[model samples]
Target: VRVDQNLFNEVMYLLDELSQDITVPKNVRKVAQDSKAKLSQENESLDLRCATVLSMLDEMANDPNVPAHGRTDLYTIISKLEALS
Candidate 1:
């Protein structure tokens, strides 16, 4: 898929669910459901300003100056989001 900033929110939301402590906290499934509810609307909003914000984030990840570890995380998130769409 083409690279874009709309993916940042999707990826980060997925990562947030992945990083949560399921055993110590509430159920993972419930957390995921909540996260889905939270992000469902932004997925379709036509506001270019929001898109621009995410575009900047994508640009940051695309930058070569970013640390290897951080870039890896960003790439992982981006890939997951691409798959999601």
Candidate 2:
């Protein structure tokens, strides 16, 4: 199935913010960065990307080092990725 372009943009914007935040801890940001890269692969189906990212971020959200604000953003990104799939 085709993914909505605008939705992907909005999700990537949020991912960009979270992944670059210095206070969020390295491991959390690392997953966010990688997930952002996963979603950006144009040749692959977004469903594949979204599903894979959803699993990765689920644990990232639960990471103890993740800041409270970062956790919320992870949740938001999760929901947005859910919408894509």
Candidate 3:
């Protein structure tokens, strides 16, 4: 996986915003935070990290309480992260 600094930064920025969005369920935000944590692990392979986060985010995307805006952002993040896989 080729990691671009700009793309990673953009994803992280979106994630941070998602995690703090009150419109989203607490569980969804928590999952977003977990995905961010997975992405943050420098010792892990990029592909492994992306796959792990993708799985968590996929589940989070199904959250019934997630706002429409949050869902849209989640999809965007997932698309960007999928490149690593």
Judging by TM-score against the true structure, name the best candidate: 2
- lDDT tens digits, residues 1-85, model 3? 2376666887788888888988888988888788888899999898888888888988878878778888898999998887546
Q: Rate the local accuracy (lDDT) of all candidates.
A: 0.48, 0.87, 0.84
Models sorted by TM-score, best on top: 2, 3, 1
Candidate 2 residue-pair clash tally? 0
In candidate 3, stretches whose alpha carbon ends up further than 4 angstroms from where it belongs are: 1-3
Kindly report which residue stretches of model 1 are placed more than 4 angstroms away from their true locations once superposed: 1-10, 13-57
Q: Which RMSD values do the candidates have, in order?
A: 9.1, 2.1, 1.9
What candidate 2 gets wrong by more than 4 Å, as runs, is 1-3
- TM-score of every candidate relative to the true structure: 0.39, 0.89, 0.88
lDDT of 3 at 43: 98
Per-residue lDDT tens digits for candidate 1, residues 13-54, read 654654463432233334334434444556665344334433
Pairing residues by index, what is the TM-score of model 3?
0.88
Report residue 84 deviation for candidate 1 (angstroms): 0.6
- What is the RMSD of candidate 2? 2.1
Model 2: per-residue lDDT, tens digit, 1-85?
A: 2357767888999889888889888888789899999988989987899999999999998888778988998999999888777
Write down the lDDT that model 1 would get: 0.48
